[PDB]
């Protein structure tokens, strides 16, 4: 129920190798303004 040994930096950062953010799509808005979110008419100048 409790850990018997502490976790080392190596083990911690190994476990944290799939813990990250992906990258969005970023289809560049052909209409006008900032770059639109894909399949989204973004509130901040999107035209999807």
């Amino acid at each position: 129920a409790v850990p018997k040994r502490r976790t080392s930096k190596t083990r911690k950062n190994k476990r944290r190798t799939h813990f990250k953010i992906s990258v969005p799509g970023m289809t560049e808005c052909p209409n006008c303004g900032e770059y639109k979110l894909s399949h989204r008419v973004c509130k901040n100048c999107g035209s999807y």
Binding site: L37, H39, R40, V41, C42, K43, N44, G46, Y48
Partner: protein, 120 residues
């Protein structure tokens, strides 16, 4: 079908509230799933309005809430009256559809997929 994280009665009441507000305003901002569910509800209401008969009027009053609109020229009508007068005439010739969903970005307090749903 979707449960929307609510109980049966809460879901029913929220759906008919959404549909009434949409009939009132003709475009509303909400979440993706709620929109994908209220779509069918409002479309069936418009079908009843196009049928136009008394029985359909009553079966639509089963669903709609009793709300008063402040129409232009200082006139007043109900959502039922609007549905059976104007929204039925606009779509007398169209066969299905009547609604369109347009995605927007996420909200701040959540990461909820915001959406506009609009009559066409």
């Amino acid at each position: 079908y979707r449960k929307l994280g609510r109980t049966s009665d809460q879901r029913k009441a929220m759906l008919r509230d959404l549909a009434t507000s949409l009939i009132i305003s003709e475009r509303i901002e909400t979440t993706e799933a709620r929109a994908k569910e209220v779509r069918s509800v409002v479309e069936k209401l418009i079908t009843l309005g196009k049928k136009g008969d008394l029985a359909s009027r009553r079966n639509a009053a089963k669903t709609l809430r009793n709300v008063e609109i402040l129409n232009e020229d200082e006139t007043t009508q109900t959502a039922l009256q609007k549905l059976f007068g104007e929204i039925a005439e606009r779509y007398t010739e169209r066969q299905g559809g009547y609604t369109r969903i347009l995605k927007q970005g996420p909200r701040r307090g959540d990461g909820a997929e915001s959406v506009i749903i609009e009559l066409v």
